[PDB]
Amino acid sequence: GAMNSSNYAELFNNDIKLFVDDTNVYRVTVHKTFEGNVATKAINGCIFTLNPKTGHLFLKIIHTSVWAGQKRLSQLAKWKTAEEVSALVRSLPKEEQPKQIIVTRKAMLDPLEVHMLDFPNIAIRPTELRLPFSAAMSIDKLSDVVMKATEPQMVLFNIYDDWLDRISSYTAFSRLTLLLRALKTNEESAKMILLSDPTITIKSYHLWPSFTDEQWITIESQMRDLILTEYGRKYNV
Amino acid sequence: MNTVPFTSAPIEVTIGIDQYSFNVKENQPFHGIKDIPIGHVHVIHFQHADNSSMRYGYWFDCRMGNFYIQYDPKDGLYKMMEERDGAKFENIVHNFKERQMMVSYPKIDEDDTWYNLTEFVQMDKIRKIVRKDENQFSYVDSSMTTVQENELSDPAHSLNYTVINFKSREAIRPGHEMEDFLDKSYYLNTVMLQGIFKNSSNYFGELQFAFLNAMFFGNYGSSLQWHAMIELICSSATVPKHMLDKLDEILYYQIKTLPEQYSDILLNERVWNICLYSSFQKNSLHNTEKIMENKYPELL
Ligand SMILES: C[C@H](Sc1ccccn1)C(=O)O
Fold it and tell me: Of A137, A163, A189, which closes a domain?
């Protein structure tokens, strides 16, 4: 049914699964109109569809034109997400299709279940984990490709860079969620941590810096300290 | 007026005849029910004094045969039977009326309650929901499951109600997923009304029959069916105006007849609040909304 800390290792078994996060699909800025009313201006968004075992992130970019002339966009956005995920699944060969799709927000269950009625064997599930996938847009290369897009577009990213050569998917997912939790809690400091040292760079074909094992431990410790720091500033501890 | 004679009443039992009911004591001189209005389906139903397990009963129409009731001490229940010998049957009934062994169907002349609950119910349609084609009458009880309940187990003893499922490929056109999930008009009007029921009278007949089986037998799958059929209309933006008007009348009398004390099990809070307050038809069920607010405000 739902996903939580008791069955956390299931993410890393050999059943193909995808997380789908729709939190950056419909994005707006809110501004005042000359008449002193408020209006929104949409900006480009993305569906964050991730295989947690492999690190494959199917980043479907949502260009603002998709909203033109449409009403009830927050509701449409969930159905548009479900349509795109369903289109993605259909585009994959059968043996690459997920056996489960885990939505990060429960409002995606019905839209996705309806779009996937053709796939009665694919389980659509919620999760009780608080995953920080909304911070995907704090990753510069992903942010850049979303904001530059002039049309709908699907871009493939490996969100783990080369980490699986050296660590397990369990550890790689744990690192990713720590990095994203940090970026979600204090984006500036998180990025300061990640790029302070100019001698460690991000390869052209990567999203994150080329940290050795020892440097990753330090980075990971600094990110924990940041999350702890913000939790303190937040709650005054 | 017609008569359902009873051979005898060997066990203490509460007998219902449509919305009426009366107690018969073990071996009391009861020989049946007289003055039954012709022109309506009826239901005669039973709840044993010694074992309220299994409410059960028989739908029938007096224009389809001469029916009587006889206790079966092997199966332990009151059985409906047909008498083919017309002369034997009149002779039996007359003898029992002459000795006044029958309760009179107590229809008040101002009262259209039964008509209003059964307006669209037809025995021919009942017999396709309750499959037992060797009898002109149809047995229902408390525990019978529906065809849809068996999919989610004996198929011969099921209620074959029309399957309604809002997250099914029947209900959802490919490429209209959002539209059809949020506005069921396609499912209501093309799939169900034009496709399956042929008309709204047949749809209402099933709806009314589902309600009556829920109320009289506490049949849970019938209550699910009654609520699904209401929800399908309430959740459609485009419903012919005459269907909405008739639906309001139908539901009104159902709500009026429901025991006040059974409201907690027979009424689904989600469907009703949706129908009355959140749905396309939130402003279209005036009579139903007014009785529901005055009689069951707790549900809302
Ligand atoms: C292109 C690969 S990631 C990926 C994501 C989705 C589908 C295929 N591959 C890489 O950059 O290592």
Answer: A163
